[PDB]
Scaffold this motif. Structure first.
Motif, PDB file in Angstrom:
ATOM      1  N   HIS C  55       5.671  -6.278   3.744  1.00  0.00           N
ATOM      2  CA  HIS C  55       4.898  -6.040   2.525  1.00  0.00           C
ATOM      3  C   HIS C  55       5.617  -6.707   1.353  1.00  0.00           C
ATOM      4  CE1 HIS C  55       2.033  -3.028   0.375  1.00  0.00           C
ATOM      5  NE2 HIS C  55       2.198  -4.121  -0.350  1.00  0.00           N
ATOM      6  N   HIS C 223      -4.142  -0.088   1.953  1.00  0.00           N
ATOM      7  CA  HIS C 223      -3.422   0.568   0.870  1.00  0.00           C
ATOM      8  C   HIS C 223      -4.081   1.912   0.576  1.00  0.00           C
ATOM      9  CE1 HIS C 223      -3.803   1.646  -3.387  1.00  0.00           C
ATOM     10  NE2 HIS C 223      -2.569   1.220  -3.585  1.00  0.00           N
ATOM     11  N   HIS C 243       0.803   2.845   2.048  1.00  0.00           N
ATOM     12  CA  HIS C 243       1.466   3.932   1.341  1.00  0.00           C
ATOM     13  C   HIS C 243       0.911   5.245   1.869  1.00  0.00           C
ATOM     14  CE1 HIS C 243       2.531   0.700  -1.485  1.00  0.00           C
ATOM     15  NE2 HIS C 243       1.238   0.461  -1.597  1.00  0.00           N
TER      16      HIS C 243
HETATM   17 ZN   LIG Z   1      -0.131  -1.101  -2.589  1.00  0.00          ZN
END
Ligand SMILES: [Zn+2]
Ligand SMILES: [Zn+2]
Ligand SMILES: [Zn+2]
Ligand SMILES: [Zn+2]
Ligand SMILES: [Zn+2]
Ligand SMILES: [Zn+2]
Ligand SMILES: [Zn+2]
Lengths: 399, 136, 399, 399
Positions: C55, C223, C243
């Motif tokens: 990422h 996300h 996340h």
């Molecule tokens: Zn993000």
């Protein structure tokens, strides 16, 4: 009104070469077939019906400059080239063709039908239908500025992404004056894209295209290389498959169960296979796909013939030079298909694929499309390269 | 209201330059290709101040097009047009020449048929069962 | 052809540090692994495979001016900055990265692959896909004049609102040359929007995106901050979650049942948490979301490791400064994850997440990506900050 | 390398028919002229240089449907018609032409030069330059919807209204690949407009066009019917006048003082005069102008020849049928111009008008453009309709 006297006649329906015959032509059709007035002496020739090529692109021809002329030339220049392309195709013994891509061929067909230029009978597909980023997407490889100026293509430009868009695209092809529908089920070789066999159509979009085409009386031809896209096209209900490079046994079983036609186009595969060895002829994104795919076509055709798949004659002209369409007979014979079957695939089976009943054989009431060669094509398939007599619609173009 | 390339498409027979300048017609111009577009087209006819709805189920004679009797509407689009018109209090008149398009219009629920050139016995049975009017 | 002599070798598959070894590299792959010609003396170092960051955003870097440079700068300036970003990332020991947003990284990847500039192996996502008003909507916060001039974004710009639009968006990402797909399932912190955890995708749109990506061979990274959007992404079939700030027990059960990967990105949370205390650094719409979300990341990572969720290495570079990607190891170890597991998550588990099998460990036949440090990272995780040897594809960049 | 043996040779420079001669052609030029190897027997024919028509429109042909095909057809169909038009023009004895309007002729010229199709040597003007509402305005007669969709034409489309716009229009003609410039000084007959002789150019715009064309090496041809516009074009410095229907004595004095060429185009006037009698052939706005203007052309040509105005050969083909360009000789002779002068106006005077020195006469070092007819055209002008030998660039097209 002309009487034709030829030493041997090939009967397309039976697949056998007969003896002397006399053919009487008035009003453009076959009227009498006496076995055993203007006269044409063909007594040292073999009589055959005119050939049909089911896969050509009369609007262009492959060249080292083919990937840069698009941004500099207009369709008018391509039409001026297509005049010679069509004349050369007609003079080689092909009295009808099926054009499977290009927006110059509907106009060339009109010009030929009005008698302005010489050519065969054209069944044109118009713009091919693809998905976003597909093999027939017209803006593949363009930069950001040009892409923003043109905008994203939609159903009017031949790019669909849903059932309703597929319906609108088929209706737009009807509005532009098409005779047949063409879709790219998978990726290809000559496109400016990365993939060449990935499935790019869902079965629901193929089913929508087929239903809409059935409403308007069209047939559907599908371009495919990979197995999954080929299977989706077959299950959707397409009429013929244009390439079968990675055909497996399950695909052949489905084709036999559904009755799908197979068009190998060996000539294009050989041409791209040889051109990939030259350095700089193809763009670096195109070269690996060509070098990998062009070599797996003849074995596929042999396997398909061995397994009982119905095969029809097509060359994918355009990739190769127009006027050399008859070398596909030699390739088919060297792939294990008999000479009589190879000749039948271009006369009566081609008429079945096209969906017409007024051509394909020398029978009473059918169109007067006749060719002749000095040799006997069944005994020696190499005789197909020497054609000296061409007749289309009762009019003689070569003697 | 028609479909793309239909009998009432306003840009049939135009050349490439004019077609690119005008753009492809949509529901605002009377050209539909799906259920939602048919709903929007009926609502646009209401917005323009109409008293009745007209669709071309098949091809015609006077249009600059090739076909003249081929079915150009699906039964789902006809049903959507009829439902939307019933919401706004309209009646639907359908132009038809061929048998299949006429049958699709009748099964969709149109009020009257504007031409019946190739009416068969099965079409007459359906018209009698549904109560469809015929205008020769 | 170079022989590598190093005192200790870390076996990624087993998770144990072995003794002296000799690595022979010809043609860019590992050929021999003698245990117990050019030569490099690393006998006072520990041998490790190159690290993968799953990422990063190599096209930019956070700054006090980051919310006004967009209207004044062009992507060319960002490319000139990305040159240094990529060099610093490569020199820190990261030989491959996964870029999850930005339209400069597909071009940087091409430049690095052609040898024009130095950098790691880039797997780029291109434009991220969102819904109207979502975390990745490119026109959030614009005024009426600019919004009217640009128009409403659609599938070509990465904004979808239905199944067909999601299909078209994935196909457009394929057309632009992407390697992986990225969607924003919920709201975020850095966007110019109000919400930061609300569900912004329906499960039907996620399922359509996943099916289209599976057709084209892509993987999907999502996300998410809120629970509902995270659960919708998991049930849709995404590969990894980027996340997990508000991960509950039911979400962990679903992740374990489906096999979803978890990328914590602790560094970004810490960075935004500290930057929110400074006055004026963030816009007033961004500051509360950052101050609330950045503090709930390390505890989530500890809980996820305790509950058996599969964890992969990622930092969300860009928010933080490029070149400091290895501090995430220290954060992971201080979050309760063992040093060996933290090292494995960046070599072999990262290769599993990426879907490749030619990297991740020092084994015969794999890519020659090797790094070395004077200390032993398992005994002391702090040794990861001193890397003095970097090798990528058999070419030495640091000694 | 071919030797030509012909009984009589017409010397264009002198205007006299000589006796037997032998012409040797190698590399496409004339090399020897023996007076008194492949051989062509023309000993019963008269030798002449190839003819030049200085006013044709190879991109179309007048028809009852000519005022409605513009909205339905594309330039590709017109190109397919132009193929036959160009072949018929070449086979009639005209080896070079000057095209004075139409955007298909620059492409036809390229195709002919590349050998794709047969035709003469084309000097194309491209788009003609006019003012707003002028004879060559491309949107005359359009309705409000179409006019709003296309927008108002400017210098890029050939419509100018000031000095700077005239400069830009000439530069745009150069950018599109033109060989000569054409302007409409007055109104015309075939346009969808009200006036047909009113002055539509100011002398300052004509002077700007002429200066810009002189910078780029072009010559200017002006279409004019009325006296005032003709006088403005002459005072601006144009090279030739394309119609002189209302030429007065003061205009002839100015033409003689300046050296302006005069191209009558009697054939077009006769054609429109006869077609105006038919009902419905012309639009009702066009019919009165045609019926009034077409009858005042032959007397003007006779008066111009009597007063000493230099006259050049032109037919305004397109209005009339392509392939009948040689009847203008008969019209000129019946207008009082001698046969020798009429023949000279199409060979050497035409070369002077075109500005070239490599053609126009059978002399050593010039292009091998030769035609032959059984009769003697000077004794009987009617022999020009029977041409049986055509040679262009050393290649024989008819024998
Ligand atoms: Zn993000
Ligand atoms: Zn193909
Ligand atoms: Zn093809
Ligand atoms: Zn009607
Ligand atoms: Zn991120
Ligand atoms: Zn004129
Ligand atoms: Zn003219």
């Amino acid at each position: 009104p002309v009487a034709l006297h030829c030493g041997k006649l090939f009967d397309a329906r039976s697949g056998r070469v007969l003896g002397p015959h006399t053919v009487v032509v008035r009003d453009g059709r076959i009227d009498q077939l006496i076995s055993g007035l203007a006269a044409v002496d063909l007594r040292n020739r073999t009589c055959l019906p005119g050939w049909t090529d089911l896969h050509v692109h009369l609007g262009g021809e492959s060249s080292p400059q083919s990937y840069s002329e698009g941004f500099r030339l207009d369709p008018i220049d391509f039409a001026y080239r297509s005049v010679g392309y069509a004349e050369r195709t007609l003079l080689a013994g092909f009295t009808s063709v099926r054009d499977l891509g290009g927006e110059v061929s509907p106009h060339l067909r009109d010009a030929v039908n009005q008698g302005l230029v010489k050519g065969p009978r054209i069944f044109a597909a118009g713009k091919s239908i693809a998905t976003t980023g597909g093999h027939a997407d017209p803006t593949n490889g363009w930069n950001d500025q040009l892409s923003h100026l043109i905008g994203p293509p939609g159903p009017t430009e031949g790019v669909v992404n849903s059932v309703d868009e597929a319906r609108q695209a088929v209706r737009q092809r009807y509005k532009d004056g098409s005779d047949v529908i063409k879709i790219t089920a998978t990726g290809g070789v000559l496109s400016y894209a990365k993939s060449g066999d990935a499935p790019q159509f869902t079965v629901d979009e193929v089913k929508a295209i087929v239903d809409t085409a059935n409403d308007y009386g069209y047939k559907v031809a599908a371009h495919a290389h990979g197995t999954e896209g080929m299977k989706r096209a077959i299950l959707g209900g397409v009429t013929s498959i244009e390439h079968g490079t990675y055909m497996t046994d399950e695909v052949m079983r489905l084709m036999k169960q559904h009755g799908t036609w197979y068009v190998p186009t060996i000539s294009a595969g050989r041409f791209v296979a040889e051109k990939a060895k030259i350095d700089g002829y193809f763009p670096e994104v195109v070269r690996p796909k060509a070098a990998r795919i062009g070599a797996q076509i003849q074995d596929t055709a042999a396997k398909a013939y061995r397994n009982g798949v119905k095969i029809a004659f097509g060359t994918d002209m355009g990739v190769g030079p127009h006027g050399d369409n008859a070398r596909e007979f030699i390739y088919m014979v060297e792939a294990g298909i008999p000479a009589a079957t190879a000749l039948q695939s271009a006369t009566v089976l081609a008429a079945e694929v096209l969906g017409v009943d007024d051509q394909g054989a020398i029978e009473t009431g059918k169109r007067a499309d006749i060719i002749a060669m000095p040799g006997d094509p069944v005994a020696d398939i190499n005789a197909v390269l020497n054609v000296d007599f061409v007749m289309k619609d009762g009019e003689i173009f070569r003697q």
